[PDB]
Copies of this chain bind each other. A is one copy, B any other.
Amino acid sequence: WQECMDYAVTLARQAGEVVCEAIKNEMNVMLKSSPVDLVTATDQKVEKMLISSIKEKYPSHSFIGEESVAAGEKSILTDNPTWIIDPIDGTTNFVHRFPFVAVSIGFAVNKKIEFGVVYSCVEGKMYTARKGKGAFCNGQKLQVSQQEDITKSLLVTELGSSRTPETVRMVLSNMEKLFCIPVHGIRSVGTAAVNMCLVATGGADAYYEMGIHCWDVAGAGIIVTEAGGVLMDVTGGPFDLMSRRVIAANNRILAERIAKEIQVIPLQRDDE
């Protein structure tokens, strides 16, 4: 898989180049499932580039990509080598020129992530992680923080892409519950992949969200775990990649405390 991975880092750098040239130019902003679910031409062409490049070298492999699943392809994860691609994680940031946009590639064999690559092109930061080998940013090794006390922790989360009132209501009240524990604070930079890479560096202690997709988190998940952190479902159980929920923490102590505090929001799975 190291060949696949070496190839992946090369593709991520190239697609990052395209994303960061486009971010300063004029854009065609179109709508996906709602007025706040957006897509530009750059989302579409970068995903096209990546999928057809990988298919060339590795014609037997499977793909799950955002814009492809949007085009009618299905998100069904099987045992076959599958590349899980978000061409632009943080499309709303991109459209606004808010300076956090990531290219994300995860690679799963037997439904387990083997390596992940996250390229934050505006910052010039390349995060990579291979199962068993550690996590790196620009060739430097990452470690999660050591905080075990929730009342001294800094959390990252997002409000999400739903404006359904009851949903929005549970998101905000889950926030209030954690805020008033109290925790030191809560941050939102606008993309799941970068929020998670900030946990891996030890800049934040935990990230949680409900509503994300498998493509938003596949690459960054192995970066957290290889840096020493943990992935978990909001029930407190095992992380389920197709479930649309994630807690990504420095350790199980903080992970479990969050799970205990927050209420589950009902969501259709990626595999339904």
Residues of B within 8 A of A204 (CB): 96, 98
A187 close to B188 (CB less than 8 A): yes
Closest to A38 in B: B184
B159 close to A179 (CB less than 8 A): yes
A97 close to B202 (CB less than 8 A): yes
Closest to A95 in B: B184
Residues of B within 8 A of A225 (CB): none
Q: Please measure, in the bound complex, the distance between the C-alpha atom of A203 and the C-alpha atom of B189, giving whole angstroms.
A: 12
State the number of copies, please. Answer: 2
- Is A66 engaged at the interface, CB distance under 8 Å to the other chain? no
A184 close to B36 (CB less than 8 A): yes
Closest to A34 in B: B182
Residues of B within 8 A of A188 (CB): 186-188
1/0 per residue A91-104: CB within 8 Å of B?
Answer: 01101111100000
Contact of A189 (CB < 8 Å), options: B154, B159, B189: B189
- Is A261 engaged at the interface, CB distance under 8 Å to the other chain? no
Chain A interface helix/strand/loop/mixed: mixed
A92 close to B185 (CB less than 8 A): yes
A184 close to B154 (CB less than 8 A): no
- Residues of A in contact (CB 8 Å), total 37
Closest to A190 in B: B187
Q: What would 26 A/B residue contacts be, using CB atoms closer than 8 Å?
A: A35-B182, A36-B182, A92-B154, A92-B184, A92-B185, A93-B154, A96-B154, A96-B203, A97-B201, A97-B202, A98-B203, A98-B204, A99-B203, A159-B175, A159-B179, A159-B186, A163-B180, A163-B182, A168-B176, A169-B176, A172-B172, A172-B175, A185-B190, A187-B188, A187-B189, A187-B190
Residues of B within 8 A of A201 (CB): 97
Residues of B within 8 A of A97 (CB): 201-203
Query: For residues 88 through 145 of chain A, which have their beta carbon under 8 Å from a beta carbon of chain B?
Result: 92-93, 95-99, 145
Query: For residues 166 through 216 of chain A, which have their beta carbon under 8 Å from a beta carbon of chain B?
Result: 168-169, 172, 175-176, 179-180, 182, 184-190, 198, 201-205
Q: Please measure, in the bound complex, the distance between the C-alpha atom of A5 and the C-alpha atom of B27, giving whole angstroms.
A: 38
Query: For residues 11 through 63 of chain A, which have their beta carbon under 8 Å from a beta carbon of chain B?
Result: 35-36, 38
* Given A92-B184, A97-B203, A172-B176, 7 new contacts (CB under 8 A): A35-B182, A36-B182, A38-B184, A96-B154, A98-B204, A99-B203, A168-B179
